[PDB]
Subunit: 120 residues, 4 copies
Amino acid sequence: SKCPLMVKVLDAVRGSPAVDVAVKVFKKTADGSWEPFASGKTAESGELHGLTTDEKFTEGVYRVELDTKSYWKALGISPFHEYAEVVFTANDSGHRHYTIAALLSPYSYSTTAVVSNPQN
Amino acid sequence: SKCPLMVKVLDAVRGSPAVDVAVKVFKKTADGSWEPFASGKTAESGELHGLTTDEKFTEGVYRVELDTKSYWKALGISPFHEYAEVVFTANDSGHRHYTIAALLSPYSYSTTAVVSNPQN
Amino acid sequence: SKCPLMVKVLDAVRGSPAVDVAVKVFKKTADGSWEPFASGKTAESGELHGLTTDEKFTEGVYRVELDTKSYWKALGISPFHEYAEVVFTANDSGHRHYTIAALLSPYSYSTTAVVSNPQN
Amino acid sequence: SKCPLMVKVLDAVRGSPAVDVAVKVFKKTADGSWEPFASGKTAESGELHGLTTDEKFTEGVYRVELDTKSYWKALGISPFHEYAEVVFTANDSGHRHYTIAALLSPYSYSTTAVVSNPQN
Ligand SMILES: N[C@@H](Cc1cc(I)c(Oc2cc(I)c(O)c(I)c2)c(I)c1)C(=O)O
Ligand SMILES: N[C@@H](Cc1cc(I)c(Oc2cc(I)c(O)c(I)c2)c(I)c1)C(=O)O
Protein backbone atom coordinates (compact mmCIF):
# COMPACT_ATOMS: atom_id res chain seq x y z
CA SER A 1 0.00 0.00 0.00
CA LYS A 2 0.94 3.67 0.44
CA CYS A 3 1.18 4.51 4.17
CA PRO A 4 3.97 2.65 6.09
CA LEU A 5 1.72 2.18 9.13
CA MET A 6 -2.03 2.27 8.73
CA VAL A 7 -4.55 1.62 11.47
CA LYS A 8 -8.18 0.90 10.70
CA VAL A 9 -10.78 0.40 13.42
CA LEU A 10 -14.28 -1.04 12.97
CA ASP A 11 -17.36 -1.12 15.24
CA ALA A 12 -19.10 -4.53 15.17
CA VAL A 13 -22.21 -3.37 17.05
CA ARG A 14 -23.30 -0.55 14.76
CA GLY A 15 -21.67 -1.88 11.62
CA SER A 16 -19.71 1.32 11.08
CA PRO A 17 -16.20 2.86 11.30
CA ALA A 18 -15.12 3.44 14.91
CA VAL A 19 -14.55 7.22 14.74
CA ASP A 20 -12.33 9.15 17.18
CA VAL A 21 -10.34 6.32 18.70
CA ALA A 22 -7.16 7.26 20.54
CA VAL A 23 -4.27 5.45 18.86
CA LYS A 24 -0.80 5.61 20.37
CA VAL A 25 2.29 3.93 18.92
CA PHE A 26 5.39 3.17 21.00
CA LYS A 27 8.88 1.90 20.14
CA LYS A 28 11.12 -0.37 22.21
CA THR A 29 14.54 1.11 22.98
CA ALA A 30 17.84 -0.76 23.45
CA ASP A 31 17.29 -1.10 27.22
CA GLY A 32 13.77 -2.48 26.89
CA SER A 33 11.92 0.74 27.76
CA TRP A 34 8.88 2.01 25.84
CA GLU A 35 9.42 5.27 24.00
CA PRO A 36 6.46 7.15 22.48
CA PHE A 37 6.71 6.96 18.69
CA ALA A 38 3.52 8.59 17.31
CA SER A 39 -0.21 8.91 17.90
CA GLY A 40 -3.52 10.23 16.61
CA LYS A 41 -7.27 9.52 16.39
CA THR A 42 -9.21 7.68 13.71
CA ALA A 43 -11.20 9.84 11.26
CA GLU A 44 -14.78 9.48 9.93
CA SER A 45 -13.60 6.47 7.88
CA GLY A 46 -12.26 4.69 10.95
CA GLU A 47 -8.75 5.01 9.55
CA LEU A 48 -5.68 6.77 10.95
CA HIS A 49 -3.41 8.41 8.38
CA GLY A 50 0.06 9.86 8.87
CA LEU A 51 1.70 8.04 11.76
CA THR A 52 5.15 7.66 10.20
CA THR A 53 7.31 8.07 7.06
CA ASP A 54 9.43 5.13 5.94
CA GLU A 55 12.50 7.05 7.03
CA LYS A 56 11.29 7.34 10.64
CA PHE A 57 9.70 3.83 10.76
CA THR A 58 12.98 1.92 11.31
CA GLU A 59 13.41 -1.76 12.15
CA GLY A 60 12.32 -2.67 15.65
CA VAL A 61 9.55 -3.85 17.98
CA TYR A 62 6.49 -1.58 17.99
CA ARG A 63 3.44 -1.27 20.19
CA VAL A 64 0.14 0.10 18.98
CA GLU A 65 -2.36 0.98 21.69
CA LEU A 66 -6.00 1.65 20.86
CA ASP A 67 -7.97 3.18 23.72
CA THR A 68 -11.02 0.91 23.38
CA LYS A 69 -12.40 1.68 26.87
CA SER A 70 -13.06 5.37 26.08
CA TYR A 71 -14.85 4.54 22.84
CA TRP A 72 -17.44 2.40 24.56
CA LYS A 73 -17.52 4.66 27.59
CA ALA A 74 -18.69 7.59 25.49
CA LEU A 75 -21.70 5.62 24.17
CA GLY A 76 -22.80 4.56 27.65
CA ILE A 77 -21.41 1.04 27.35
CA SER A 78 -19.00 -0.32 29.95
CA PRO A 79 -16.52 -2.54 28.05
CA PHE A 80 -14.41 -5.36 29.36
CA HIS A 81 -10.87 -4.43 28.19
CA GLU A 82 -8.94 -1.34 29.38
CA TYR A 83 -7.47 -0.97 25.89
CA ALA A 84 -6.76 -3.01 22.80
CA GLU A 85 -3.11 -3.62 22.07
CA VAL A 86 -1.02 -4.93 19.18
CA VAL A 87 2.73 -5.54 19.67
CA PHE A 88 4.90 -6.53 16.70
CA THR A 89 8.35 -6.50 15.12
CA ALA A 90 8.85 -4.41 11.96
CA ASN A 91 11.27 -4.19 9.04
CA ASP A 92 13.57 -6.87 10.53
CA SER A 93 13.56 -8.60 7.14
CA GLY A 94 13.11 -5.55 4.94
CA HIS A 95 11.06 -2.37 4.73
CA ARG A 96 7.36 -3.14 4.54
CA HIS A 97 4.10 -1.18 4.72
CA TYR A 98 1.74 -2.42 7.43
CA THR A 99 -2.02 -2.09 7.90
CA ILE A 100 -3.31 -2.98 11.35
CA ALA A 101 -7.05 -3.55 11.21
CA ALA A 102 -9.04 -4.06 14.40
CA LEU A 103 -12.72 -4.92 14.96
CA LEU A 104 -14.28 -3.77 18.26
CA SER A 105 -17.03 -5.21 20.44
CA PRO A 106 -17.74 -4.43 24.12
CA TYR A 107 -16.50 -7.79 25.38
CA SER A 108 -14.41 -8.84 22.40
CA TYR A 109 -12.01 -7.65 19.70
CA SER A 110 -10.17 -9.29 16.82
CA THR A 111 -7.06 -7.85 15.15
CA THR A 112 -5.47 -8.58 11.75
CA ALA A 113 -2.34 -7.41 9.96
CA VAL A 114 -1.80 -6.86 6.23
CA VAL A 115 1.86 -6.69 5.27
CA SER A 116 2.67 -5.43 1.75
CA ASN A 117 6.03 -4.94 0.05
CA PRO A 118 6.49 -1.36 -1.31
CA GLN A 119 8.97 -2.39 -4.08
CA ASN A 120 8.98 -5.05 -6.82
CA SER B 1 -17.43 -35.74 24.37
CA LYS B 2 -20.02 -38.43 23.47
CA CYS B 3 -22.11 -36.76 20.75
CA PRO B 4 -20.03 -36.22 17.56
CA LEU B 5 -21.58 -32.79 16.91
CA MET B 6 -21.80 -29.78 19.26
CA VAL B 7 -22.62 -26.12 18.71
CA LYS B 8 -21.22 -23.53 21.11
CA VAL B 9 -22.51 -19.95 20.64
CA LEU B 10 -21.24 -16.78 22.37
CA ASP B 11 -22.54 -13.22 22.53
CA ALA B 12 -19.78 -10.66 22.00
CA VAL B 13 -21.81 -7.68 23.11
CA ARG B 14 -22.70 -8.94 26.60
CA GLY B 15 -19.85 -11.28 27.46
CA SER B 16 -21.97 -14.38 27.89
CA PRO B 17 -23.04 -17.53 26.03
CA ALA B 18 -25.95 -16.94 23.65
CA VAL B 19 -29.04 -18.70 25.00
CA ASP B 20 -31.91 -20.24 23.04
CA VAL B 21 -30.46 -19.56 19.60
CA ALA B 22 -32.28 -21.68 17.02
CA VAL B 23 -30.00 -24.30 15.48
CA LYS B 24 -31.17 -26.34 12.46
CA VAL B 25 -29.06 -29.01 10.78
CA PHE B 26 -29.53 -29.91 7.12
CA LYS B 27 -27.84 -32.78 5.29
CA LYS B 28 -27.39 -33.00 1.53
CA THR B 29 -29.15 -35.88 -0.24
CA ALA B 30 -28.14 -37.90 -3.32
CA ASP B 31 -30.68 -36.23 -5.62
CA GLY B 32 -29.02 -32.88 -4.83
CA SER B 33 -31.18 -30.92 -2.35
CA TRP B 34 -31.13 -30.57 1.47
CA GLU B 35 -33.17 -32.31 4.16
CA PRO B 36 -33.69 -31.78 7.93
CA PHE B 37 -31.15 -33.72 9.98
CA ALA B 38 -31.68 -32.27 13.46
CA SER B 39 -32.74 -29.23 15.49
CA GLY B 40 -32.55 -27.64 18.89
CA LYS B 41 -31.78 -24.48 20.80
CA THR B 42 -28.72 -23.48 22.81
CA ALA B 43 -29.00 -23.86 26.59
CA GLU B 44 -27.88 -21.66 29.49
CA SER B 45 -24.24 -22.54 28.75
CA GLY B 46 -24.73 -21.42 25.15
CA GLU B 47 -24.13 -25.00 24.05
CA LEU B 48 -26.25 -27.54 22.23
CA HIS B 49 -24.98 -31.09 22.67
CA GLY B 50 -27.06 -34.20 22.08
CA LEU B 51 -28.09 -33.46 18.49
CA THR B 52 -27.36 -36.86 16.98
CA THR B 53 -25.64 -40.15 17.84
CA ASP B 54 -22.26 -41.27 16.43
CA GLU B 55 -24.35 -43.84 14.50
CA LYS B 56 -26.88 -41.52 12.79
CA PHE B 57 -24.12 -39.06 11.84
CA THR B 58 -22.80 -40.63 8.59
CA GLU B 59 -20.36 -39.11 6.09
CA GLY B 60 -21.61 -36.35 3.83
CA VAL B 61 -22.13 -32.61 3.40
CA TYR B 62 -23.83 -30.74 6.28
CA ARG B 63 -25.41 -27.34 6.96
CA VAL B 64 -25.74 -25.81 10.42
CA GLU B 65 -28.15 -22.87 10.40
CA LEU B 66 -28.29 -20.49 13.36
CA ASP B 67 -31.21 -18.05 13.59
CA THR B 68 -29.24 -15.00 14.71
CA LYS B 69 -31.93 -12.47 13.68
CA SER B 70 -34.49 -13.52 16.32
CA TYR B 71 -31.79 -13.49 19.02
CA TRP B 72 -30.95 -9.80 18.46
CA LYS B 73 -34.57 -8.76 17.71
CA ALA B 74 -35.31 -9.90 21.25
CA LEU B 75 -32.84 -7.38 22.69
CA GLY B 76 -34.07 -4.45 20.64
CA ILE B 77 -31.24 -4.78 18.13
CA SER B 78 -31.84 -4.92 14.38
CA PRO B 79 -28.91 -7.16 13.26
CA PHE B 80 -27.36 -7.30 9.82
CA HIS B 81 -27.33 -10.97 8.84
CA GLU B 82 -30.52 -12.94 8.32
CA TYR B 83 -28.65 -15.88 9.87
CA ALA B 84 -25.22 -17.47 10.35
CA GLU B 85 -24.69 -20.57 8.23
CA VAL B 86 -21.93 -23.22 8.35
CA VAL B 87 -21.54 -25.71 5.47
CA PHE B 88 -18.96 -28.53 5.56
CA THR B 89 -18.20 -32.13 4.52
CA ALA B 90 -18.15 -34.48 7.52
CA ASN B 91 -16.41 -37.79 8.18
CA ASP B 92 -14.95 -38.18 4.71
CA SER B 93 -11.84 -39.61 6.42
CA GLY B 94 -13.48 -41.98 8.91
CA HIS B 95 -15.46 -41.10 12.06
CA ARG B 96 -14.67 -37.84 13.91
CA HIS B 97 -15.92 -35.23 16.41
CA TYR B 98 -16.77 -31.72 15.31
CA THR B 99 -17.66 -28.78 17.52
CA ILE B 100 -18.73 -25.73 15.52
CA ALA B 101 -18.38 -22.52 17.51
CA ALA B 102 -20.00 -19.18 16.71
CA LEU B 103 -19.19 -15.71 18.12
CA LEU B 104 -22.08 -13.28 17.69
CA SER B 105 -22.19 -9.52 17.19
CA PRO B 106 -25.01 -7.53 15.50
CA TYR B 107 -22.98 -6.67 12.37
CA SER B 108 -20.37 -9.45 12.35
CA TYR B 109 -19.72 -13.08 13.36
CA SER B 110 -16.83 -15.58 13.52
CA THR B 111 -17.34 -19.30 13.08
CA THR B 112 -14.79 -21.94 14.18
CA ALA B 113 -14.34 -25.66 13.63
CA VAL B 114 -12.81 -27.94 16.23
CA VAL B 115 -12.20 -31.56 15.18
CA SER B 116 -11.44 -34.19 17.83
CA ASN B 117 -10.05 -37.62 17.01
CA PRO B 118 -11.36 -40.54 19.13
CA GLN B 119 -8.68 -43.22 19.53
CA ASN B 120 -10.04 -45.91 17.20
CA SER C 1 -19.78 7.45 -8.06
CA LYS C 2 -19.01 4.55 -5.69
CA CYS C 3 -20.92 1.28 -6.19
CA PRO C 4 -23.49 -0.12 -3.67
CA LEU C 5 -21.98 -3.54 -2.90
CA MET C 6 -18.33 -4.28 -2.11
CA VAL C 7 -16.49 -7.41 -1.02
CA LYS C 8 -13.10 -7.34 0.71
CA VAL C 9 -11.34 -10.62 1.60
CA LEU C 10 -8.16 -11.04 3.68
CA ASP C 11 -5.95 -14.05 4.41
CA ALA C 12 -5.06 -14.58 8.08
CA VAL C 13 -2.40 -17.27 7.53
CA ARG C 14 -0.37 -15.17 5.05
CA GLY C 15 -1.38 -11.70 6.22
CA SER C 16 -2.31 -10.33 2.83
CA PRO C 17 -5.35 -9.96 0.61
CA ALA C 18 -7.00 -13.12 -0.72
CA VAL C 19 -6.62 -12.98 -4.51
CA ASP C 20 -8.95 -14.92 -6.83
CA VAL C 21 -11.59 -15.95 -4.34
CA ALA C 22 -14.69 -16.87 -6.38
CA VAL C 23 -17.65 -14.70 -5.40
CA LYS C 24 -21.33 -15.38 -6.15
CA VAL C 25 -24.26 -13.12 -5.20
CA PHE C 26 -27.93 -14.10 -5.13
CA LYS C 27 -31.28 -12.39 -4.69
CA LYS C 28 -34.32 -14.02 -3.08
CA THR C 29 -37.48 -13.93 -5.21
CA ALA C 30 -41.24 -13.82 -4.67
CA ASP C 31 -41.35 -17.66 -4.69
CA GLY C 32 -38.91 -17.75 -1.78
CA SER C 33 -36.32 -19.08 -4.23
CA TRP C 34 -32.86 -17.76 -5.16
CA GLU C 35 -32.12 -15.89 -8.38
CA PRO C 36 -28.58 -15.28 -9.84
CA PHE C 37 -27.66 -11.63 -9.14
CA ALA C 38 -23.92 -11.27 -9.82
CA SER C 39 -20.47 -12.91 -9.58
CA GLY C 40 -16.77 -12.12 -9.77
CA LYS C 41 -13.32 -12.72 -8.30
CA THR C 42 -11.26 -10.70 -5.82
CA ALA C 43 -8.46 -8.71 -7.47
CA GLU C 44 -4.93 -8.32 -6.08
CA SER C 45 -6.22 -5.85 -3.49
CA GLY C 46 -8.42 -8.72 -2.33
CA GLU C 47 -11.41 -6.57 -3.26
CA LEU C 48 -14.26 -6.99 -5.76
CA HIS C 49 -15.87 -4.09 -7.60
CA GLY C 50 -18.62 -3.50 -10.13
CA LEU C 51 -20.68 -6.36 -8.76
CA THR C 52 -23.67 -4.14 -9.52
CA THR C 53 -25.09 -0.59 -9.75
CA ASP C 54 -27.37 1.63 -7.63
CA GLU C 55 -30.33 1.07 -10.00
CA LYS C 56 -30.03 -2.75 -10.04
CA PHE C 57 -29.41 -3.18 -6.31
CA THR C 58 -32.95 -2.78 -4.90
CA GLU C 59 -34.51 -3.82 -1.59
CA GLY C 60 -34.37 -7.55 -0.92
CA VAL C 61 -32.65 -10.53 0.64
CA TYR C 62 -29.17 -11.22 -0.76
CA ARG C 63 -26.73 -14.06 -0.36
CA VAL C 64 -23.06 -13.51 -1.06
CA GLU C 65 -21.33 -16.89 -1.44
CA LEU C 66 -17.55 -17.15 -1.15
CA ASP C 67 -15.72 -20.13 -2.61
CA THR C 68 -13.21 -20.54 0.21
CA LYS C 69 -12.51 -24.25 -0.32
CA SER C 70 -10.94 -23.86 -3.77
CA TYR C 71 -8.84 -21.01 -2.40
CA TRP C 72 -7.18 -23.12 0.29
CA LYS C 73 -7.03 -26.33 -1.77
CA ALA C 74 -5.06 -24.37 -4.35
CA LEU C 75 -2.33 -23.61 -1.75
CA GLY C 76 -2.15 -27.22 -0.55
CA ILE C 77 -4.24 -26.53 2.54
CA SER C 78 -7.24 -28.71 3.38
CA PRO C 79 -9.81 -26.32 4.86
CA PHE C 80 -12.97 -27.13 6.77
CA HIS C 81 -15.89 -25.20 5.20
CA GLU C 82 -17.08 -25.73 1.62
CA TYR C 83 -17.68 -21.98 1.31
CA ALA C 84 -18.50 -18.93 3.44
CA GLU C 85 -21.99 -17.54 2.92
CA VAL C 86 -23.32 -14.11 3.95
CA VAL C 87 -27.12 -13.66 3.89
CA PHE C 88 -28.52 -10.18 4.61
CA THR C 89 -31.32 -7.74 3.73
CA ALA C 90 -30.40 -4.79 1.52
CA ASN C 91 -31.76 -1.28 1.00
CA ASP C 92 -34.12 -1.85 3.91
CA SER C 93 -34.10 1.80 5.04
CA GLY C 94 -34.14 3.05 1.46
CA HIS C 95 -30.82 3.36 -0.38
CA ARG C 96 -27.52 2.40 1.30
CA HIS C 97 -23.99 1.29 0.43
CA TYR C 98 -22.60 -2.01 1.75
CA THR C 99 -19.25 -3.60 2.44
CA ILE C 100 -18.80 -7.25 3.31
CA ALA C 101 -15.41 -8.10 4.81
CA ALA C 102 -14.42 -11.70 5.32
CA LEU C 103 -11.27 -12.93 7.09
CA LEU C 104 -10.07 -16.38 6.03
CA SER C 105 -8.34 -19.21 7.87
CA PRO C 106 -8.41 -22.98 7.28
CA TYR C 107 -10.80 -23.91 10.14
CA SER C 108 -12.26 -20.47 10.83
CA TYR C 109 -13.76 -17.45 9.11
CA SER C 110 -14.86 -14.09 10.46
CA THR C 111 -17.25 -11.89 8.45
CA THR C 112 -18.33 -8.32 9.18
CA ALA C 113 -20.38 -5.62 7.50
CA VAL C 114 -20.04 -1.84 7.24
CA VAL C 115 -23.22 -0.01 6.26
CA SER C 116 -22.80 3.61 5.24
CA ASN C 117 -24.89 6.39 3.73
CA PRO C 118 -23.90 7.98 0.37
CA GLN C 119 -25.18 11.32 1.77
CA ASN C 120 -25.27 11.86 5.55
CA SER D 1 -16.75 -24.73 37.92
CA LYS D 2 -14.51 -23.70 40.86
CA CYS D 3 -11.93 -21.85 38.73
CA PRO D 4 -12.43 -18.06 39.07
CA LEU D 5 -10.10 -17.44 36.13
CA MET D 6 -9.94 -19.60 32.99
CA VAL D 7 -8.14 -19.20 29.66
CA LYS D 8 -8.92 -21.22 26.52
CA VAL D 9 -6.96 -21.02 23.27
CA LEU D 10 -7.67 -22.44 19.78
CA ASP D 11 -5.61 -22.88 16.61
CA ALA D 12 -7.42 -21.72 13.43
CA VAL D 13 -4.97 -23.31 10.98
CA ARG D 14 -5.07 -26.89 12.31
CA GLY D 15 -8.58 -26.67 13.79
CA SER D 16 -7.89 -27.90 17.32
CA PRO D 17 -6.86 -26.52 20.77
CA ALA D 18 -3.59 -24.60 21.03
CA VAL D 19 -1.52 -26.98 23.17
CA ASP D 20 1.55 -25.82 25.15
CA VAL D 21 0.83 -22.10 24.91
CA ALA D 22 2.48 -20.15 27.72
CA VAL D 23 0.19 -17.94 29.79
CA LYS D 24 1.32 -15.38 32.36
CA VAL D 25 -1.16 -13.45 34.50
CA PHE D 26 -0.11 -10.20 36.14
CA LYS D 27 -1.98 -8.03 38.61
CA LYS D 28 -1.69 -4.26 38.89
CA THR D 29 -0.09 -3.78 42.31
CA ALA D 30 -0.87 -1.19 45.01
CA ASP D 31 1.97 1.09 43.88
CA GLY D 32 0.91 0.95 40.22
CA SER D 33 3.38 -1.74 39.08
CA TRP D 34 2.71 -5.16 37.52
CA GLU D 35 3.25 -8.09 39.89
CA PRO D 36 3.37 -11.77 38.80
CA PHE D 37 0.13 -13.58 39.62
CA ALA D 38 -0.08 -16.93 37.83
CA SER D 39 1.69 -18.77 34.99
CA GLY D 40 1.06 -21.98 33.12
CA LYS D 41 0.73 -23.61 29.73
CA THR D 42 -2.36 -24.82 27.92
CA ALA D 43 -3.12 -28.50 28.39
CA GLU D 44 -4.20 -30.89 25.61
CA SER D 45 -7.61 -29.17 25.79
CA GLY D 46 -5.95 -25.83 25.15
CA GLU D 47 -6.97 -24.49 28.58
CA LEU D 48 -5.79 -23.63 32.11
CA HIS D 49 -7.80 -24.56 35.21
CA GLY D 50 -5.36 -24.23 38.10
CA LEU D 51 -4.71 -20.53 37.48
CA THR D 52 -6.10 -19.16 40.76
CA THR D 53 -8.64 -19.51 43.58
CA ASP D 54 -11.84 -17.64 44.58
CA GLU D 55 -9.91 -16.12 47.53
CA LYS D 56 -6.55 -15.21 45.95
CA PHE D 57 -8.33 -13.78 42.89
CA THR D 58 -9.38 -10.47 44.44
CA GLU D 59 -10.48 -7.19 42.82
CA GLY D 60 -8.15 -5.22 40.56
CA VAL D 61 -6.89 -4.81 36.99
CA TYR D 62 -5.31 -7.98 35.62
CA ARG D 63 -3.06 -8.64 32.65
CA VAL D 64 -3.13 -11.91 30.76
CA GLU D 65 -0.31 -12.40 28.25
CA LEU D 66 -0.26 -15.29 25.79
CA ASP D 67 3.08 -16.15 24.16
CA THR D 68 1.86 -16.72 20.61
CA LYS D 69 5.20 -15.95 18.99
CA SER D 70 6.81 -19.02 20.56
CA TYR D 71 3.74 -21.11 19.73
CA TRP D 72 4.01 -20.38 16.03
CA LYS D 73 7.80 -20.61 15.78
CA ALA D 74 7.86 -24.13 17.25
CA LEU D 75 5.88 -25.04 14.11
CA GLY D 76 8.16 -23.45 11.56
CA ILE D 77 5.66 -20.62 11.16
CA SER D 78 6.91 -17.06 11.58
CA PRO D 79 3.94 -15.08 13.03
CA PHE D 80 3.14 -11.37 13.02
CA HIS D 81 2.41 -10.47 16.65
CA GLU D 82 5.11 -10.53 19.31
CA TYR D 83 2.43 -11.89 21.69
CA ALA D 84 -1.27 -11.49 22.64
CA GLU D 85 -2.07 -9.40 25.70
CA VAL D 86 -5.46 -9.03 27.41
CA VAL D 87 -5.84 -6.37 30.14
CA PHE D 88 -9.09 -6.06 32.15
CA THR D 89 -10.65 -4.92 35.44
CA ALA D 90 -11.90 -7.84 37.55
CA ASN D 91 -14.54 -8.35 40.26
CA ASP D 92 -16.04 -4.87 39.98
CA SER D 93 -19.53 -6.44 40.30
CA GLY D 94 -18.98 -9.00 43.07
CA HIS D 95 -17.17 -12.33 42.82
CA ARG D 96 -17.95 -13.81 39.39
CA HIS D 97 -16.32 -16.23 36.90
CA TYR D 98 -14.02 -15.20 34.08
CA THR D 99 -13.20 -17.04 30.89
CA ILE D 100 -10.76 -15.58 28.41
CA ALA D 101 -10.82 -17.13 24.97
CA ALA D 102 -8.43 -16.65 22.07
CA LEU D 103 -8.56 -17.84 18.45
CA LEU D 104 -5.03 -17.85 17.00
CA SER D 105 -3.81 -17.54 13.40
CA PRO D 106 -0.36 -16.44 12.18
CA TYR D 107 -1.41 -12.85 11.31
CA SER D 108 -4.59 -12.58 13.33
CA TYR D 109 -6.12 -13.29 16.70
CA SER D 110 -9.53 -12.85 18.33
CA THR D 111 -10.32 -12.64 22.02
CA THR D 112 -13.53 -12.57 23.97
CA ALA D 113 -14.54 -12.59 27.61
CA VAL D 114 -17.23 -14.79 29.01
CA VAL D 115 -18.30 -13.51 32.43
CA SER D 116 -20.56 -15.92 34.28
CA ASN D 117 -22.38 -15.76 37.62
CA PRO D 118 -21.44 -18.67 39.97
CA GLN D 119 -24.63 -19.05 42.03
CA ASN D 120 -27.40 -17.81 39.71
N1 LIG E 1 -17.54 -26.57 27.50
C1 LIG E 1 -16.68 -25.74 26.60
C2 LIG E 1 -17.53 -24.65 25.93
C3 LIG E 1 -16.71 -23.75 25.03
C4 LIG E 1 -16.25 -24.24 23.83
C5 LIG E 1 -15.35 -23.48 23.08
I1 LIG E 1 -14.70 -24.32 21.31
C6 LIG E 1 -14.88 -22.22 23.49
O1 LIG E 1 -13.93 -21.48 22.73
C7 LIG E 1 -14.15 -20.40 21.84
C8 LIG E 1 -13.24 -19.34 21.87
C9 LIG E 1 -13.41 -18.27 20.98
I2 LIG E 1 -12.07 -16.67 21.00
C10 LIG E 1 -14.43 -18.21 20.07
O2 LIG E 1 -14.55 -17.18 19.25
C11 LIG E 1 -15.31 -19.27 20.06
I3 LIG E 1 -16.85 -19.18 18.68
C12 LIG E 1 -15.21 -20.39 20.93
C13 LIG E 1 -15.40 -21.77 24.72
I4 LIG E 1 -14.83 -19.94 25.51
C14 LIG E 1 -16.29 -22.52 25.49
C15 LIG E 1 -15.52 -25.16 27.49
O3 LIG E 1 -15.84 -24.42 28.43
O4 LIG E 1 -14.37 -25.49 27.19
N1 LIG F 1 -9.43 0.28 2.51
C1 LIG F 1 -10.71 -0.11 1.85
C2 LIG F 1 -10.84 -1.65 1.83
C3 LIG F 1 -10.87 -2.25 3.23
C4 LIG F 1 -12.08 -2.40 3.88
C5 LIG F 1 -12.09 -2.89 5.19
I1 LIG F 1 -13.92 -3.10 6.13
C6 LIG F 1 -10.93 -3.25 5.89
O1 LIG F 1 -10.97 -3.71 7.22
C7 LIG F 1 -10.97 -5.05 7.64
C8 LIG F 1 -10.84 -5.31 9.00
C9 LIG F 1 -10.83 -6.65 9.43
I2 LIG F 1 -10.64 -7.05 11.48
C10 LIG F 1 -10.95 -7.71 8.56
O2 LIG F 1 -10.95 -8.96 8.99
C11 LIG F 1 -11.08 -7.39 7.21
I3 LIG F 1 -11.26 -8.93 5.85
C12 LIG F 1 -11.09 -6.08 6.73
C13 LIG F 1 -9.73 -3.09 5.18
I4 LIG F 1 -7.93 -3.59 6.09
C14 LIG F 1 -9.68 -2.60 3.86
C15 LIG F 1 -11.89 0.62 2.60
O3 LIG F 1 -11.58 1.56 3.35
O4 LIG F 1 -13.03 0.22 2.37
